[PDB]
Each structure stands twice: as C-alpha cells, then as structure tokens.
A paper describes a structure:
To find the acetyl-CoA binding site of EcMaeB, we collected cryo-EM data of EcMaeBholo in the presence of acetyl-CoA (EcMaeBacetyl-CoA) and determined its structure at 2.03 Å resolution. The cryo-EM map of the ME domain was ambiguous as is in the cryo-EM data of EcMaeBholo despite the higher resolution. As with EcMaeBholo, local refinement of the ME domain dimer sharpened the NADP+ and Mg ion maps. Due to the ambiguity of the cryo-EM map of the ME domain, detailed discussion on the ME domain structure at an each-residue level is difficult. However, cryo-EM maps for secondary structures show that the ME domain of EcMaeB moves when acetyl-CoA binds to the PTA domain. The movement of the ME domain resulted in a slightly narrower space above the substrate binding site in EcMaeBacetyl-CoA. This observation suggests the possibility that acetyl-CoA binding makes it difficult for the substrate and/or cofactors to bind to EcMaeB.
While reducing NAD(P)+ to NAD(P)H, MEs catalyze the oxidative decarboxylation of the TCA cycle intermediate L-malate to produce the TCA carbon source pyruvate and a byproduct carbon dioxide (CO2) in the presence of divalent metal ions such as a magnesium (Mg2+) ion. The hybrid-type MEs consist of an N-terminal catalytic domain (ME domain) and a C-terminal activity regulating domain. The PTA domain does not possess an enzymatic activity of PTA but acts as an allosteric modulator of catalysis; that is, binding of some metabolites to the PTA domain increases or decreases the enzymatic activity. Binding of acetyl-CoA to the PTA domain is known to reduce the catalytic activity of several hybrid-type MEs.
Numbering used by the authors:
A (entry chain A), B (entry chain B): 2 to 440
Write the structure that this text describes.
Amino acid sequence: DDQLKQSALDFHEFPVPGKIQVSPTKPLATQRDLALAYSPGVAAPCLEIEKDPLKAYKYTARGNLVAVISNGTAVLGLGNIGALAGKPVMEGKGVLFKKFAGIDVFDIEVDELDPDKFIEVVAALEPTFGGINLEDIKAPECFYIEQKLRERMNIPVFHDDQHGTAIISTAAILNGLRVVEKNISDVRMVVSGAGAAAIACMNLLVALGLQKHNIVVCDSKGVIYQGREPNMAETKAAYAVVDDGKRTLDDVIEGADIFLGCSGPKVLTQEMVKKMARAPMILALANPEPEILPPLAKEVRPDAIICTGRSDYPNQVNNVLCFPFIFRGALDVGATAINEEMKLAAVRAIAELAHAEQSEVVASAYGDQDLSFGPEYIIPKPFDPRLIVKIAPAVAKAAMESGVATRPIADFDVYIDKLTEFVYKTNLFMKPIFSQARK
Amino acid sequence: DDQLKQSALDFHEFPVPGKIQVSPTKPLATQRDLALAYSPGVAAPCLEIEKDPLKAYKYTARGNLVAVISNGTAVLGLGNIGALAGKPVMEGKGVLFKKFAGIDVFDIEVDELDPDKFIEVVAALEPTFGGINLEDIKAPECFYIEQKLRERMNIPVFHDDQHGTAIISTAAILNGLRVVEKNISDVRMVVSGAGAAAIACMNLLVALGLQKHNIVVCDSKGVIYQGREPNMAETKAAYAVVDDGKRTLDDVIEGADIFLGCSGPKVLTQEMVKKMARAPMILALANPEPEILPPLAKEVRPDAIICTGRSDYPNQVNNVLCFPFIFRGALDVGATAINEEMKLAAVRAIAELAHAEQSEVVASAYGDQDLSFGPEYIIPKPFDPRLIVKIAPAVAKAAMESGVATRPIADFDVYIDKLTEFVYKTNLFMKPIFSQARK
Ligand SMILES: NC(=O)c1ccc[n+]([C@@H]2O[C@H](COP(=O)([O-])OP(=O)(O)OC[C@H]3O[C@@H](n4cnc5c(N)ncnc54)[C@H](OP(=O)(O)O)[C@@H]3O)[C@@H](O)[C@H]2O)c1
Ligand SMILES: NC(=O)c1ccc[n+]([C@@H]2O[C@H](COP(=O)([O-])OP(=O)(O)OC[C@H]3O[C@@H](n4cnc5c(N)ncnc54)[C@H](OP(=O)(O)O)[C@@H]3O)[C@@H](O)[C@H]2O)c1
Ligand SMILES: [Mg+2]
Ligand SMILES: [Mg+2]
C-alpha cells in the first residue's frame, strides 16, 4: 500500500504538476497569423456561426470536445470527498478519453450539492461542448439529474457509471446465454444491491428481453418486497416483489440462472451457488473484493460462468470497453442524443467481437492469445485495438436510423479506414511482454 | 474583406476543425502507467487533497489553469451574437494566453443572459480553476457581475475588457505626464463615452492621483450632468457634473490636458484639439476608426501626444500587453485575488519598461528599434519579450505584501531566471523581418 501510494503521488507531481495540458493546434510565429487567429480575422468564423449554428463543427473544436463533469459525491470507492478532491480522477478519465479515441476532454468539478442547482449549472454550459459525460455522482440523485439533463439538453448526456457497465454486463449475459443455451425470456435473475450500477443494468436487460416478473432484488435490508418500508424510493419500487415471506438472499437464489452482484464482498457463498440452476451465470462486480471469489465458485459448480471486475480473473468488466467508442460514434455523426437503439447497437457489437473473433497479427509468442469463445472468454479484453472499429460505426449507423444524427456519414468504408488509421498509430505491446514475463 | 474573410475561414477549418487540443503531459503506454493515472493509483492524490485542499496545486493542473468565460453579449465589435458564435474568440484568447505566458486555458461559453443566474453558474465552477478571466460581456451588466463574483469567489476574478485597457492606458498617461511635465493632481481630463473601457480607466486614474472634480464625461447624449435623466444609471452618476449649460464636447474641451476616447469615430476635430492645453495628451481607442487620425492631430498641435488602438500608428494600446503576465504573476504565488495593489504594480512595471529602457540584443538591422523614450515611444510594443520578466515578479511581490498570496516565493532571482528561460524558448523573429520588408 505504502509503495503504491508513494509511486502514485510522485507519478505526476514532480515533472510538472498533474496530467493534462492545452496545446494550440497550429504553429504561430508571425503577425498575420495572430491577425486571423484573433484580431479582425477571427470575426469571420463568428459571423458564420451566427448565421448558421451548425457551422460551429467546422470552425471550432466542438465536434470533438466532451465534458467530464462531477460534484465529487461518489468518487471511485472513496465516497463523498468533495469536488476539489476528485479532480485527479476526472483528469485521468479525460486522459483515457484521449488515448483510446482521440477525444478532447474538459474536466469540470462543480461545487453544487443540490440536484436542481446542479442541473441549472450544467444545462447552461451546452454551447461549449459536443457531449457531456456525467461521472461520480451518488445515488439516488444521479437518476434524477441525468433524466432532467437529458430532457433539457440537445447534446448527448451519458452517465458512465450507470450505462457503460450496463452495456458491458448485457453484452456478457447475451454471450453467456449462448454458451449455456438458454433463452432471455425464460431466465430467472437475482440482483444483489440496488444503486447506480444495478438499476441501469436491470433496465437494459429488460429492454433486451428479460421479464420483470423473473427479477428479484436484494439490498442491505434484504429482499426488496412491496410494503417493506413506508416510503420506498423510486427505481426501488419498480422491482419490488409481492410479499411472500422471502427476506434474505438464500431464499431467492434456489433455481436462479443469473446472479448479478454490485454490492459488497462475501455476499454469495458456496451453498447458495450449489442451489443455483444448471450452468449458472455469475457476475460479481464488487470492486475491492467480489461477492464470491471465482475459484470458490468453480469448485462446487465447475460448469459455472463467472465474470468479475478484477484484472486477475477472466471476463473482466472494465468500463474502458465502451465509453470512448460510443462517444466517438455519437460525435462523428453529430448526434443530439445517445438513445436506447444506439445503446443496444453497442451491446451487440461488443458481444459479436467475442464470439466472431478473427484474431490476425497476434503478439508473436509474446503473450497469451486463447481468444476462443467459451466460458473463459465471454467478452473482449479491456484494451483490444479493434473495439474502436466495431463499436463506433455501429453506434453511428444506429444514430442515423433513429433520426438523431445531424451530420450523417456518406460512406462507412472511408469512416472505417479512418478509424483503422487512428488505431494503427497506437499499440500497447509492452503489456503482453510484462504479462508473459510474470509467468 | 472577401480575400481576408476567405483566408481567415480557411485558417483553421481544413487541417482539423478549430484551434486548441487537450494533450496528456505524461507518456501512457503500458499497464502500471494506466494504473497510476487511474485505477487504484489515482486514489492517493485524491486522499491528499481531502486532508489539505492546498495540495491541489501539487498533484493537479489547477495552479496553471485559467477559465475564459463569456456569454457572447459583447463580442469584439460585433455585439450581441450569442455564446456559441463567440467560441472562436475565446479559443483565440486562450491561444494567446498559452503563447506568451504558458498558461492552460479552458474556454467556457454560457448561454445565460440574466446576471444573477450567470453569477450562480460561474461561482459553482471554482474547484476547476485557479483563476477566472471574464470576457466579452456587455455593460452595464459587466460591472455588477464582476463585483458579485469578486466578493463571492476565492480565486482571482478579472474582467479583461475593463482592467487590461485601464492598466495599459494608465501606464501611457503616467509616462506622458513625464514627457509634457505636468502633475497628475492638476490636469483636466475629458472622457468621450462611458462604458466597460472608460469607467475602469477613470477609476484607476482617480486611484493613482487624478482629482475626480477634474473630470467631465460625455456619452452619446453629450455631457453627463446631474439631473439629466429621471433614472441615471450607476457608474454614470458618480462622474456626472453640476448643470452649468455645458452640453456638447465643444463646451468642455477648452483647456483640457487629457482626452480619453472610447467611443466612435470622428468624435474629436482639429478645432477642438486647437483649444486644448499645451502639449495635448490624446488617447483615441475607438477600434474600428479612432476618434481622430493622429496625422490630423499632429498637423495643428505638433507637441501633442497621441495614442491609438491601431498598429499602423505609434503608441498602440493593445491588451496583449497586460493580461497574460498579471495572470502569470498571480498564479505563481497562489493569489486569492487580483486587488488594487497588484493592478498598480503592473502599471508601474509597464511604465518603467518604456521610460527606463535598456534595449540590448536588437534584431540586428532586421527591424525598426528606435526604443528611445519620447512622444513616439511612450509604452512598450505589443510583443516585447521583457514584459513577463518585469510584470510577473512585480505582481507576485505585490500579492505577497497585500496578504493575498498563499504560496510565497522565497527567492526572486530563481523566479526571474525561470521566466527568462521561458522567454528564450519562444522568439518571434519573423515579425520584424516582415515589417522591415514592407518598408
Ligand atoms: N465495472 C465494474 O467493475 C463496476 C462498475 C460499477 C460498480 N462496481 C462496484 O459495484 C459496487 C457498487 O457500486 P454502485 O455504483 O452500485 O454504488 P452504491 O449503489 O452506492 O453501492 C451499492 C449499494 O448496494 C447496497 N449494498 C451495499 N452493501 C451491500 C451488501 N453487503 N449486501 C447487499 N446490498 C448491499 C447498498 O444500497 P442500500 O444502502 O440502499 O441497501 C449500496 O448503496 C462497488 O463495489 C463498485 O466499485 C463495479
Ligand atoms: N485597447 C483598445 O484598443 C480598446 C480597448 C477597449 C475598447 N476599445 C474600443 O473602444 C470602443 C468602446 O468600447 P467599450 O467597451 O467602452 O464599448 P461600449 O461600452 O459598448 O460603448 C462605449 C459607450 O460610449 C458611448 N458612445 C457611443 N458612441 C458614442 C459617440 N459617438 N459619442 C459619444 N459617446 C458614444 C455609448 O454610451 P451610451 O450609449 O450610454 O451613450 C457606448 O455604450 C470600441 O471601439 C472598442 O473596441 C479599444
Ligand atoms: Mg466512475
Ligand atoms: Mg474583448
């Protein structure tokens, strides 16, 4: 801990303070160059945007600018630490946005703790940005804030901690259902924990075909049943079950095909997994420590499919899998929203990439490929270079079909060539070398 | 126009859209590199800032980050064009901030037209930035907005269109009084126009020693006198004079030592210059076309000292002379404000650089130096490389003495050497070559 802490503190304070810098995209050394980057020259772009608001994507950086906005109320796993203390996290997220999709990011830390005040603050910034990524806002205010901002603004508003993990988890459940040969309309699902990542996953899975009468939820109190507390929260009363004497996790797990966990460590035990239905699908996403260790489940039930959020186990749910590429697809077509069809276009592409993989140009002997679709490889690996070329055109085409695109793509072959060109300029070959050298 | 228009539109539409890009400052290609910039690594800086908010300058880019914020209500000379149409101007101002002082800038365009709502939007963004530059906001809302933000926020708030021109124009008058040998407390000033740049100039000049009873202001209606309109706006009533019959500019120009002009073209005539006192000091800053052409003034009064806002004449009052360097000085010492003592320190440094000049290392014959103090050289030239080495330490020292500095500078020789190092690594040698080539 101390070594990791010291290496992180020095990781960037010493060369210059902090990551991120703003750089001009032009050489500038003369007059007549400053006379049209400013001065009477800069009045020509302004008078064009005034006549046509759609011309702002030609003359400014708006078509490539995303805001990462937070108020510091749920920062990683630290909790409520304040907007100022969460600045490094937002800078890091902007770094990830740039590294894997080439998207410029402004990270904004708002001091408002009141939801309506926060909404008023964010809705006023629309002319600056081409899209908004809400990050690290505690539940249940996140649902209300995102819903209000989405119905108030004419640029995409995407809360990543809700919807990115939902997209990845839905892609994993569809692929796992193929392995175990079940149907989405018959499966019994048990959800542990209600919160930012859980409500959104249930919503997406219902949108793809899961029956709401096949879902039971449990939180820190136990089973969410109807009339348990006098005033149950919204989004918690939409999944409450009729009272039947069931109050703990052990009552509802018998016969469950799917376990979805986003709540605490050591929640699911070996006996409960034993009582589960044949070929169980288990998603233990609790971050410091999963609800069950994958070795402890594969022993009692070796036919189980397990999917955690850690890097030392297969099938890792890492949010870097979708957000840069969905935002790239939305930005490149001038979409005014990221709707459900665009969101479902991302689920299908991610699942397809893992069960229709066509490798090519492996990392020599330097690594470990085993990209065979099955219980151990159900979703793509977090830094797979083909994720930009699969997701972004699918999201762009979905945007063009739901009528939310303002700058439609004429030829998708040219677009795919450009994206492949971008991805060739970025390879991470030291990662396979380090991984192989670990053994 | 059409040639200039087409060249300016193409200036940045074609390589990529718009100026500005966001770049990481640390190399990112491996794991353990995207595990300190994010992942469990990024939690260590966050817990440091939670304990001590001052550590946000060590682990984060806040100590070098400035916001240029506008609502597009007074954009250059175009007027009320909207926040979105003014985005190129803000990007250009950020580029100038980066070129001459090495300061990262986020340009923010806010759609709010209501002053109190605008204030609520801006004050909430304080954790993001180390300082605020207000830009292109029409009067009289600008005074109210700036006063409220300054009393509300704990980082420097600085409206450039008021205070930068006030500082530069006060430096010119201070030097011109040296040339013409007059005392600040005994001169009569006539101000043509009352607005963002005029009220601020008068306030600063009065702060330096001008008697308020030696000032007469004259807006588009003529002389501003007591009881002229039923509800005379504030900032226009503190400079109203008693009613004496004086209504036009012709009745107040006789015997005036200083004429300050920030209102329209062809306001001052030759016969009105003929009536001024000995050695008239004239500042005609109306940007499209000045109040009087300097040749027309010099024809009748060869001893007159004329300043303009146009570069084709000597003594050009250009805002690039002030804002980057005062912001650099305030940022380097952790100033929580830019008060009056810091504003006047910048006035003296600018005046000293021109009346106590020691040239050295001219651009050989490639240029036109003639940097001798006198009527034709009263303030430094717009891109003089010694401006940051003179202004930033003066402002930092003033912040240290007025008590608003949170990170005092221990050694000023080290600071000056660092600023000199920055100056060396950015030289504009093509400008004097082109200027001499034109002659
Ligand atoms: N892709 C990923 O790896 C990924 C993505 C998102 C989240 N996660 C992880 O998932 C966890 C929760 O994230 P979140 O956004 O959902 O935050 P959250 O809603 O604030 O926390 C989970 C919620 O579930 C309930 N809960 C907590 N402990 C529980 C327990 N032992 N048994 C049952 N319910 C419990 C609590 O709700 P009540 O207090 O109302 O009962 C709690 O607020 C964290 O560990 C997070 O890191 C992982
Ligand atoms: N460093 C520089 O070169 C520099 C810096 C700042 C400004 N400027 C220039 O100065 C001018 C004014 O700037 P500002 O910010 O003060 O704008 P402003 O506040 O919008 O306009 C100046 C005010 O002067 C009055 N006025 C207008 N025409 C007049 C006339 N013909 N005779 C007398 N008064 C008149 C009007 O006040 P009423 O409507 O209340 O009568 C007007 O609102 C512009 O040309 C601007 O570009 C130059
Ligand atoms: Mg997050
Ligand atoms: Mg301006």
